[PDB]
Design a protein around this ligand. Structure first.
Ligand code: HEM
Length: 416
């Protein structure tokens, strides 16, 4: 058990594919251990992870987006060339200002505003499926799931038609860069794109200020800035366009990819939801608990504090294995049972808990559900192809990079 702690290394397929199994030894007998390879303390139980989430002052989110690659000087020269602000936004921002800015900026995330976005999401998903439904074999990631949540994020932000087109090239992957160990070349490539995107968003922001009463989160926040100029700076506003895209894009991509994989691998359940689409919200919620996109999430202590009887020093890094919590038999009865009727499925921790709890989780849920509904209605007869599933190595987000499915187009329901 001591060897397991000393050898712990999440940068390998076993942690990405089934992290809950990978740390089951710790969840059952070692609720906190130090991982030398990471200089992280690792917690694996639902109650422990809830305890850390619940106190945003003692357990700071400052390391949530900190890569495990050595710092790159070329990355900073590139970002400084583009005038990058290096702002911490809500997800990794400390108190007191975090909750004050959340208070001022959260209103457009309210569920009453969801119906405003649902038609655009349904239309996006329909058009995406139209592009491949007649082919008989598709990669659901590259051919639909990757792009939909990016474009939905742009709509939520209020990006105008013309700009959304020019932004397609900025829909790059950030997961390894923020949560993994990118090579020096990967660091530089991402930095350049982020600098260019910063530049572009600065021009979008100026234009949005010209039409500050129009729709979308950016315009709403511009109006809030006029009311609370000491809370919302120009640099923070500029940083939030990218922050919200990154928060909204790959998270939803991975959630939906995993959900489809789980549903198609549990064919009796795919059968049920094809016959009764009203089961889909519940089914998506248990997909998040059983095969959710969040393997782990991070905090850093700001004071000495006891966790599972160990006094952590100031500044200690903590890896919360959220996937292990979601499979914790001490909170979830029969946790390895994929049960879309599970009454407490929504107590999973993929959206966090407490001060930073995901602001867009119900938009994320809607996207998952609409994509599942479209595929179950129009391709009930598809199945997973024989394939290897590859996972990008990083501590936080897990999903197959591709998801090949196959079907007989002549049996498409819409041809009957
Ligand atoms: C299934 C999809 C998603 C997942 C799994 C997810 C996951 C998360 C997680 C783990 C956090 C941090 C939780 C914490 O520290 O307590 C978070 C926060 C956040 N999410 Fe999401 N997210 C998703 C979709 C979205 C979407 C679509 C949006 C925007 C429309 C969004 C916007 C945000 C924002 C702004 C925060 C920062 C909240 C804060 O720190 O106060 N997320 N999300």
């Amino acid at each position: 058990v001591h060897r397991l702690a000393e050898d712990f290394d999440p940068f390998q397929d076993a942690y990405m594919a089934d992290p809950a199994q990978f740390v089951r030894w710790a969840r059952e007998q070692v609720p906190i251990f130090y991982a030398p390879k990471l200089n992280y303390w690792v917690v694996t139980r639902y109650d422990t992870i809830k305890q850390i989430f619940r106190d945003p002052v003692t357990f700071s989110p400052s390391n949530v987006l900190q890569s495990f690659a050595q710092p790159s000087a070329e990355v900073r020269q590139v970002l400084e060339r583009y005038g990058y602000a290096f702002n911490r936004t809500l997800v990794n921002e400390d108190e007191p200002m975090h909750l004050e800015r959340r208070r001022v900026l959260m209103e457009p995330f309210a569920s009453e505003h969801l119906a405003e976005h649902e038609p655009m999401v349904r239309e996006l998903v329909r058009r995406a499926v139209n592009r491949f439904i007649d082919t008989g074999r598709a990669d659901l990631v590259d051919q639909m799931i990757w792009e939909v949540p990016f474009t939905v994020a742009l709509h939520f932000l209020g990006v105008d038609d013309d700009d959304r087109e020019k932004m397609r090239r900025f829909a790059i992957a950030h997961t390894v860069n923020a949560f993994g160990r990118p090579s020096p070349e990967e660091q530089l490539a991402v930095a350049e794109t982020v600098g260019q995107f910063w530049q572009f968003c600065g021009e979008v922001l100026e234009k949005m200020r010209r039409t500050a009463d129009g729709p979308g989160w950016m315009r709403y926040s511009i109006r809030q800035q006029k009311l609370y100029p000491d809370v919302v700076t120009d640099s923070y506003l500029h940083s939030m366009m990218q922050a919200i895209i990154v928060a909204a894009h790959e998270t939803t991509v991975f959630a939906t990819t995993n959900a489809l994989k789980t549903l198609l691998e549990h064919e009796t359940v795919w059968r049920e939801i094809c016959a009764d689409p009203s089961l889909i919200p519940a089914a998506a919620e248990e997909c998040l608990r059983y095969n959710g996109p969040v393997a782990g999430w991070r905090r850093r202590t700001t004071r000495e504090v006891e966790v599972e009887g160990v006094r952590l020093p100031v500044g200690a890094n903590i890896l919360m294995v959220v996937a292990s919590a979601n499979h914790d038999s001490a909170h979830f009865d029969d946790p390895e049972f994929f049960d879309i009727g599970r009454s407490n499925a929504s107590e999973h921790l993929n959206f966090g808990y407490g001060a930073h709890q995901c602001l867009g989780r119900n938009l994320g849920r809607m996207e998952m559900q609409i994509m599942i509904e479209e595929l179950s209605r129009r391709l009930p007869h598809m199945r997973l192809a024989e394939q290897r599933f590859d996972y990008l190595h990083n501590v936080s987000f897990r999903a197959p990079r591709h998801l090949w499915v196959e079907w007989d187009p002549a049996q498409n329901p819409e041809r009957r």
